[PDB]
Amino acid sequence: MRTYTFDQVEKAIEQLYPDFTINTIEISGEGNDCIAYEINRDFIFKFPKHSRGSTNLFNEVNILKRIHNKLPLPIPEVVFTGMPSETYQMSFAGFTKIKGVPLTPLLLNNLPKQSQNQAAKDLARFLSELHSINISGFKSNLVLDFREKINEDNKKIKKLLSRELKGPQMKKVDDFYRDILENEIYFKYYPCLIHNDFSSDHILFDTEKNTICGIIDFGDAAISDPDNDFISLMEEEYGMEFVSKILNHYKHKDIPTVLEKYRMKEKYWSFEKIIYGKEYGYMDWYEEGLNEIRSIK
Ligand SMILES: NC[C@H]1O[C@H](O[C@H]2[C@H](O)[C@@H](O[C@H]3O[C@H](CO)[C@@H](O)[C@H](N)[C@H]3O)[C@H](N)C[C@@H]2N)[C@H](O)[C@@H](O)[C@@H]1O
Numbered sequence: 001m002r003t004y005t006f007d008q009v010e011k012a013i014e015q016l017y018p019d020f021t022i023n024t025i026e027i028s029g030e031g032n033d034c035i036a037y038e039i040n041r042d043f044i045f046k047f048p049k050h051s052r053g054s055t056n057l058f059n060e061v062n063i064l065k066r067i068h069n070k071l072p073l074p075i076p077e078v079v080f081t082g083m084p085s086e087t088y089q090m091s092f093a094g095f096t097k098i099k100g101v102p103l104t105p106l107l108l109n110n111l112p113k114q115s116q117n118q119a120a121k122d123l124a125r126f127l128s129e130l131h132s133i134n135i136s137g138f139k140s141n142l143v144l145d146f147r148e149k150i151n152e153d154n155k156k157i158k159k160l161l162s163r164e165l166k167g168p169q170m171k172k173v174d175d176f177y178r179d180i181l182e183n184e185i186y187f188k189y190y191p192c193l194i195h196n197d198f199s200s201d202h203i204l205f206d207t208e209k210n211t212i213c214g215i216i217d218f219g220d221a222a223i224s225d226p227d228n229d230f231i232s233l234m235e236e237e238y239g240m241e242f243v244s245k246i247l248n249h250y251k252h253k254d255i256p257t258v259l260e261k262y263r264m265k266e267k268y269w270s271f272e273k274i275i276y277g278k279e280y281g282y283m284d285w286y287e288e289g290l291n292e293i294r295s296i297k
């Protein structure tokens with residue numbers, strides 16, 4: 001999992017964009033996939049920490065380009081792109097920086113009621129349009145069929161914890177995965193483009209106008225279940241009271257299902273920690289997930 005010096009970042013950009021003068025550069029943030037650099041306080045440059053992260057970066061670029069000027073809220077726009085190597089699909093990507101601060105649950109509840117209501121309505125309107133984008137042309141590398149995902153994870157879990165679990169413990173894993181695949185509600189959704197990481201950290205807020213001024217980080221965006229973008233808002237995120245406002249402005253017809261999917265995904269995070277803990281090499285995630293699996297059902 002690679003890192004970069006400011007010297008390296010400036011070199012990589014100069015190679016492809018010589019006339020682009022860099023005056024200021026600092027670490028804006030860091031995720032599991034990329035390190036974010038704020039350059040000239042105008043752009044956010046994402047550099048992949050590893051090969052897997054570069055694929056996410058490549059997909060974010062692809063998705064952001066085709067949904068450009070189709071959404072009611074400002075989203076990052078691709079301005080600079082890197083090159084493929086034998087290690088990365090995308091060496092880097094430069095996006096427009098969206099000004100604003102994360103709409104934290106604490107900031108949200110300190111707002112006047114009219115601003116809170118407008119925030120819920122703006123979020124619902126954004127999701128309504130996002131989930132309505134024509135997803136034909138989006139190739140299967142952007143498609144996240146949930147049933148395929150569950151079945152693929154199961155095979156990964158078996159191959160991973162084959163010698164890590166005792167008899168009865170692996171039986172519970174079989175039971176849990178069977179109960180999920182047995183429930184038709186998890187797979188009956190109409191596939192749409194989703195943000196797939198729709199939380200408070202990625203909802204930027206303009207404190208001067210008291211309005212939401214951007215949605216960022218589309219690195220996990222894919223064609224899947226629209227309910228994913230509501231579940232992610234109640235995980236520590238927004239209270240159920242505020243999400244219900246969004247859901248009702250969204251005209252959602254089956255809230256208890258969203259809550260059921262919410263409970264399932266909460267329990268499912270244990271298995272995610274095993275897979276990601278071994279893929280991303282997060283040995284603390286692996287041991288956490290392994291401890292949790294060895295305990296409940
Ligand atoms: N941390 C502990 C929490 O983890 C998940 O929730 C969080 C996501 O993890 C974050 O995103 C990162 O993790 C995702 C899953 O690996 C990646 O897809 C994504 N690219 C990553 O940036 C997202 N910003 C906030 C969300 N509340 C679980 O659902 C939650 O129960 C658990 O308490």
Ligand SMILES: [Cl-]
Pocket residue numbers: 016017018019020
């Ligand atoms: Cl240039």
